[PDB]
Design a protein around this ligand. Structure first.
Ligand SMILES: N[C@@H](Cc1cc(I)c(Oc2ccc(O)c(I)c2)c(I)c1)C(=O)O
Length: 246
């Protein structure tokens, strides 16, 4: 590999990696709300709506499905299934917001300047921000605008998600080595898929910087959550939302 890159060849996926790629892609497509017809099926949140009580209410009433779809995505990855229960929980809690944010970001529309949540609710920066996210909204929107020129396909989005999922640095993990090895497997297949796609200069390095940003979005959301349960009541939070962000 290192030798091949030296010569200047950009290795494309092996047959082994194409299998992994098909698996991850299908896992994402099956659990991606509203499939590919999301634009027609989206409804714009009334300009008047939107910590703003009602805005927060709308978002939190649909976060349960969004969350379980992330779990559904992970369940369809055999590597994820090989991990012990404790690690599975830790990986899910860790990447949940990161992946949900990605899925919202990739559905940014310059025309309306909105993101689409769960493929059905189109919101502006101001609305998402006032409904509880604060600056996390700015971060997700900036990412979305930024990603439009990356022209990511379902496979690329799927692989980003898999890389986020398999983070061996989540506190409390037991299977550090194994999870890192899983991630390396995804990263390699990812880079090979990107060579095959032939996008844009320094594409791969630029994409990896997005991984870091999604990381940040997850972390700031944790802080936002602490700010929220100081304001909003506790009864305003759905049970699964509480389980994941504790
Ligand atoms: N759109 C995604 C899922 C998704 C659903 C929702 I509601 C989102 O807004 C949030 C998220 C966390 C919060 O604490 C609050 I308040 C609002 C986002 I960002 C993403 C998908 O397609 O799976």
């Amino acid at each position: 590999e290192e030798l091949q890159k030296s010569i200047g060849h950009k290795p494309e996926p092996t047959d082994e990696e194409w299998e992994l790629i098909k698996t991850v892609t299908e896992a994402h497509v099956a659990t991606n709300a509203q499939g590919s017809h999301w634009k027609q099926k989206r409804k714009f949140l009334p300009e008047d709506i939107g910590v703003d009580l009602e805005a927060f209410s709308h978002f939190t009433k649909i976060i349960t499905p969004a969350i379980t779809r992330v779990v559904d995505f992970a369940k369809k990855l055999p590597m994820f299934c090989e991990l012990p229960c404790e690690d599975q929980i830790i990986l899910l809690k860790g990447c949940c917001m990161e992946i949900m944010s990605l899925r919202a970001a990739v559905r940014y529309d310059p025309e309306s300047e909105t993101l689409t949540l769960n493929g059905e609710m189109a919101v502006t920066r101001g609305q998402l921000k006032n409904g509880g996210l604060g600056v996390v909204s700015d971060a997700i929107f900036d990412l979305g605008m930024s990603l439009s020129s990356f022209n990511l396909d379902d496979t690329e989005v799927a692989l980003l998600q898999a890389v986020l999922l398999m983070s061996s640095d989540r506190p409390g993990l037991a299977c550090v080595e194994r999870i890192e090895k899983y991630q390396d497997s995804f990263l390699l297949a990812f880079e090979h898929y990107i060579n095959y796609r032939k996008h844009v200069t320094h594409f791969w390095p630029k994409l990896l910087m997005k991984v870091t940003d999604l990381r940040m979005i997850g972390a700031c959301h944790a802080s936002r959550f602490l700010h929220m349960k100081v304001e909003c009541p506790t009864e305003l939070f759905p049970p699964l939302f509480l389980e994941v962000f504790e």
